[PDB]
Structures are given as C-alpha cells and as structure tokens.
Design a protein around this ligand. Structure first.
Ligand SMILES: [Zn+2]
Length: 234
C-alpha cells in the first residue's frame, strides 16, 4: 500500500526487476571478510571464490557505478557490510548460493552498470594484399580481448593469409576478459590478474602477491594462468 513503487527500484538499480531484488533479505550472503593489504577479501566458503575474485578485481579497477543503488551497496561492501553487493552479484549472474560462478561472465554483465573508464584498441592484421587489416577500439570499464602479449592468430582470409589479433593500445582504466582458450603468458601488462590456482585467485602484479580467499601468498605471475587483467591508466 505504501511501499517504494517498483519503478523507483528500477531507477535506483538500473534493471527492470530490481524491486524483486530489493525485497529479498541479503543476510545469507554476509560472508566473513578481512582487509588484506588495503582491500576487502572474502573468506573462502560455499564455493564463493568467484565472488571474491570479482570483488577484488573491481577494487583494483576502482569503478564508479552509474546507478545509486549499485554505488550504495558497493560503498557498503568496501566498508565491510558485504551482503547486499554479494547477493547482487549472485542475482545478476544467476548462480545458486553454494555453486561456482564464472568471473569473466560476471564482470561482463557489470559493464553496463559502470561508468566507462578506459578503452582498448585491437588490431586484426593480415599480410594479404587483397584484404585490409582492421582496427577496433572498445570503450567501457570491462571489455573482451586476448590477454596474450604478442596476440594470437584468428583464422585465415579466403586467400589463405593468417589473421592476427593483438591489443595495440589501452587508455584509461579497464578490465580485459580473455577471449579464447586459457594459455600461459606473457600477458598484456596490468596491475592485477584474475587467475586459476583448482579455483579462482587474484594476483597483485605490483606486490607480486596472490589473494586466495583471505590468505595471501608471495608468488610470481609466471606460475599462473590468467583469465582477465585489470589495467590502470594505460
Ligand atoms: Zn585475403
């Protein structure tokens, strides 16, 4: 009779069924957390490693959210009230509590809720004399691109020349989600990498440390297979 209208929640959160999220208790998603080297990390529990990696990646990115409700739940997350933002991730990605989710799939959905912060330029080059190399610049906070330093082949033109795809520039701040099969480095340089340790971790590339839940391990990027890279001011 006297509730916030449903369209008020949709404006607040930016998706049409937000009232159905807003009515739900979020307290089952209040995972234990600690602040480890200045960032909020979730203790490993209930297959939540994918949530920890998503939220640590976002803290390396430093996003500005487009919608007030996201901004509010994010500010609460960083100050230690984590449940609402964590539930929001399970809700948006569509993962049962207790099941594993895919970090890159989740980050990909979050792009529309975040103010654009960077751009990535990918060249698809060929030596063919009939076909032309192409260049495409994607602008956002999260974008799909090969995270392999020297690029990768991408099939052939009909004249039998290889196409090669490669990141040739990054401006601003952006997370690149790896596009193809998982491979060893060298990787495009960034501040942090989402990686596989049999589960998700996040590697800080300036401190050379790996977050595993709330634990921290000094190790090297060479020991890891990265699925995404967080790049800051180029
Ligand atoms: Zn050709």
């Amino acid at each position: 009779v006297n509730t916030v209208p449903d369209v008020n929640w949709s404006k607040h959160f930016g998706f049409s069924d937000a009232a159905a999220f807003a009515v739900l208790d979020h307290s089952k998603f209040a995972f234990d957390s600690e602040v480890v080297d200045g960032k909020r990390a979730l203790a490993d529990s209930d297959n939540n490693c994918w949530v920890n990696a998503t939220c640590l990646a976002l803290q390396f990115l430093k996003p500005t959210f487009k919608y007030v409700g996201w901004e509010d739940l994010w500010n609460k997350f960083v100050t230690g009230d984590v449940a609402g933002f964590v539930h929001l991730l399970y809700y948006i990605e569509g993962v049962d509590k207790g099941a594993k989710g895919d970090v890159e799939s989740t980050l990909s959905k979050l792009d529309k809720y975040i103010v654009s912060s960077g751009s990535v330029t990918v060249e698809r080059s060929t030596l063919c004399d009939r076909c032309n190399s192409t260049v495409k610049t994607v602008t956002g906070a999260i974008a799909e691109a090969s995270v392999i330093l020297n690029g990768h082949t991408d099939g052939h033109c009909p004249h039998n020349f290889e196409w090669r795809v490669q990141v040739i520039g990054v401006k601003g701040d952006i997370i690149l989600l790896h596009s193809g099969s998982l491979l060893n480095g060298p990787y495009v340089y960034g501040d942090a990498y989402v990686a596989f340790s049999g589960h998700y971790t996040v590697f800080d590339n300036k401190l050379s440390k790996m977050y595993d839940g709330i634990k921290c391990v000094k190790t090297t990027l060479d020991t890891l297979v990265a699925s995404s890279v967080v790049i800051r001011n180029g």
